[PDB]
Ligand binder design. Sequence first.
Ligand SMILES: O=C1N=C(NS(=O)(=O)c2cccc3ccccc23)S/C1=C\c1ccccc1Oc1ccccc1
Length: 363
Amino acid sequence: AQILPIRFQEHLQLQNLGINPANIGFSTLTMESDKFICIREKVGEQAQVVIIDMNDPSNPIRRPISADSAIMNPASKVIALKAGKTLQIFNIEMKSKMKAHTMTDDVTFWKWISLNTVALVTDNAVYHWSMEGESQPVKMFDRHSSLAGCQIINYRTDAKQKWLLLTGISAQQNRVVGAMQLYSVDRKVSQPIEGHAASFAQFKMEGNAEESTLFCFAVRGQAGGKLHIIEVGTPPTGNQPFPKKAVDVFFPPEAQNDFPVAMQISEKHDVVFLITKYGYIHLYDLETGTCIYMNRISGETIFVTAPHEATAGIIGVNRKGQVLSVCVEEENIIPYITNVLQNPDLALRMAVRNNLAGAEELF
Ligand SMILES: O=C1N=C(NS(=O)(=O)c2cccc3ccccc23)S/C1=C\c1ccccc1Oc1ccccc1
């Protein structure tokens, strides 16, 4: 068989839209959802910000805007801008300031965690800040000492905002070591975890009426590459617990310095997408951890990812400016699982879930 369980797509080449490759990187380019990319560029002496609307990519909007960091809202024409310790949320459509706040501590990382809330990470704490109303940032938890001095690379929550996860990395010798802090809002407890990339997911087990809240993380530490899928906290009333899964994360012999950097989980397909530093993608079944597919999909590091809503896939930007995505190929995944993976248990479970499109309708 020459069929794949995935479809790879190239959506854009940012260098073809007038972006300097020097600005295609984590400190200057943000992609908080699949709807926009925002780039900060200094051209001559002038600070400029560029917004690429992914529905209208050939018409980037570029303006002289001074900001140390810029993150578009996941859905609205709303942008958060930082300069020093002062933060602003700005309504672009209405050319009007929504909210502003001056922090005491420097915000070293920030990210939209929902359609209306931005998370703020300082050296010692994490806050949530609504874009609505008058409310100021609210401290969610204090940072755990295991993340001290890390470079923060991600912050994310489960859908219900009851489980909060901060992820950093640090250099030790010639290694890149991942440190995570998982915080339970209900329990007011943190747990340190050695991890490089992670995501949450909602999964409805066979036999259960209510979805389980799953936490998936991957790491490459002293025991090698490992992926874990675990239910966090107490199951919903009436549910059976999700049995913890643990599987190997493979790296080939020529990739001893590769490690996980990003994860997204398909809401529709119950598949984990894992991206590595060297530009590999792995697919894993969320229920079992079974590895479905691995391949190198990018010749450059992919430094930012988001869910790709249209395909329930993953979209990312690599360092040369290729905007790429991977999703399940809904017609070919079960054939691939049947004849290449030769995993009929998975083939059957996937068909029973019945979340793969088949046979086009008339409207
Ligand atoms: O020059 C301008 N270009 C704008 N484009 S945008 O699409 O709304 C727009 C807004 C925010 C971020 C953007 C990033 C990339 C591309 C366009 C952006 S808003 C604007 C000036 C402005 C408008 C309202 C209130 C204040 C404004 O600036 C001032 C700053 C300091 C002091 C006085 C004014």
